[PDB]
Amino acid sequence: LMQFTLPVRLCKEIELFHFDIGPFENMWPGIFVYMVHRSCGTSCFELEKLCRFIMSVKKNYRRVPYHNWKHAVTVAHCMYAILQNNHTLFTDLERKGLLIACLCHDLDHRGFSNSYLQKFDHPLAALYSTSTMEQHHFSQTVSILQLEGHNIFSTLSSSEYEQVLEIIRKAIIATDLALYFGNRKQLEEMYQTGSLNLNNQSHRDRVIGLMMTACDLCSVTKLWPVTKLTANDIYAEFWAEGDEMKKLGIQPIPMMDRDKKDEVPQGQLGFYNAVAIPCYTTLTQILPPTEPLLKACRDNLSQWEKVIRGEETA
Numbered sequence: 001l002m003q004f005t006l007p008v009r010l011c012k013e014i015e016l017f018h019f020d021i022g023p024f025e026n027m028w029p030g031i032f033v034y035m036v037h038r039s040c041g042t043s044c045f046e047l048e049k050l051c052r053f054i055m056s057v058k059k060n061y062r063r064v065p066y067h068n069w070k071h072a073v074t075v076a077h078c079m080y081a082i083l084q085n086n087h088t089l090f091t092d093l094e095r096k097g098l099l100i101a102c103l104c105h106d107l108d109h110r111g112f113s114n115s116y117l118q119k120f121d122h123p124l125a126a127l128y129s130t131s132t133m134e135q136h137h138f139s140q141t142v143s144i145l146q147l148e149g150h151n152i153f154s155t156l157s158s159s160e161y162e163q164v165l166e167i168i169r170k171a172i173i174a175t176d177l178a179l180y181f182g183n184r185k186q187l188e189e190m191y192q193t194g195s196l197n198l199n200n201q202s203h204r205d206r207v208i209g210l211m212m213t214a215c216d217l218c219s220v221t222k223l224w225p226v227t228k229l230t231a232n233d234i235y236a237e238f239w240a241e242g243d244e245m246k247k248l249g250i251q252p253i254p255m256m257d258r259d260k261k262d263e264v265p266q267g268q269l270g271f272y273n274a275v276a277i278p279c280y281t282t283l284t285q286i287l288p289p290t291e292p293l294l295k296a297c298r299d300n301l302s303q304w305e306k307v308i309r310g311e312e313t314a
């Protein structure tokens with residue numbers, strides 16, 4: 001066989017939840033295949049269809065500041081770490097589908113929210129009236145699968161193929177944060193009451209959804225310098241959106257207004273308390289070995305407090 005291998009530093013550190021995939025774009029396909037060979041197995045996908053599918057996916061990500069090809073691989077790496085430290089809980093189809101869902105989850109993102117598409121009257125908002133962007137990301141995933149030499153799920157049965165596409169579809173839709181609030185409430189109650197059942201498909205669906213939120217936000221779970229530099233990239237997109245809102249003659253919400261640059265630390269504080277902490281808390285409860293995502297979220301929360309109190313710069 002041919003195994004994929006990484007330099008010694010990468011081979012060890014890719015196992016830590018807080019691994020940063022680095023600034024060399026040409027290493028990222030290599031890193032993703034390695035993660036698939038170790039979580040799934042070297043037999044899950046024909047290497048030549050994978051390589052062709054990966055490079056077609058890369059080509060349909062845009063060069064936007066945050067929702068880009070580096071984000072896709074970073075989210076997949078977080079899923080890799082959740083999957084490797086909970087290896088007894090997931091099926092063969094789920095390992096296969098969820099890494100792929102993560103790589104494809106923001107395909108053809110232009111840096112604008114579902115709200116902007118609705119106010120702009122983008123054609124996609126008439127096609128898909130809710131989770132607009134997320135339904136487009138899936139649709140693009142399907143397009144690429146249906147290119148010649150690109151069906152990585154060729155070896156699967158007719159009914160398996162349909163299950164793995166349903167796993168991918170729900171996983172991608174679950175990255176609509178407007179759906180996370182509801183999904184986290186439900187999982188919290190089910191966990192506190194004792195009803196949560198990993199053999200119930202609609203319960204599996206909710207947990208995978210929560211893993212997808214955790215993976216999608218995992219930028220708040222990195223070493224402080226990575227988390228701080230990554231917040232520049234997200235605000236660059238938010239502020240460009242708020243400018244386009246103002247051009248429609250609409251006041252953007254505060255997080256998208258570049259005039260409120262100085263309230264960024266206070267907004268981060270808001271985001272960690274209302275969203276990130278709850279998220280990593282509930283995921284730790286359901287999946288104890290994902291502890292370090294919560295620990296590292298709390299540490300960066302503590303860092304943002306330092307920034308507000310003038311004991312840190314940004």
Ligand SMILES: Cn1nc(-c2ccccn2)cc1NC(=O)c1nc(C2CC2)ccc1Nc1cncnc1
Binds near residue numbers: 219267
């Ligand atoms: C709710 N909210 N309010 C403010 C705010 C409010 C007022 C003033 C200034 N900012 C900012 C935000 N959201 C995020 O910061 C944020 N959102 C999202 C998902 C799109 C939702 C993902 C990540 C986020 N952060 C982040 C990402 N990657 C590294 N580090 C941090």
Ligand SMILES: [Mg+2]
Binds near residue numbers: 105106133175176
């Ligand atoms: Mg998205």
Ligand SMILES: [Zn+2]
Binds near residue numbers: 071075175216
């Ligand atoms: Zn994303």
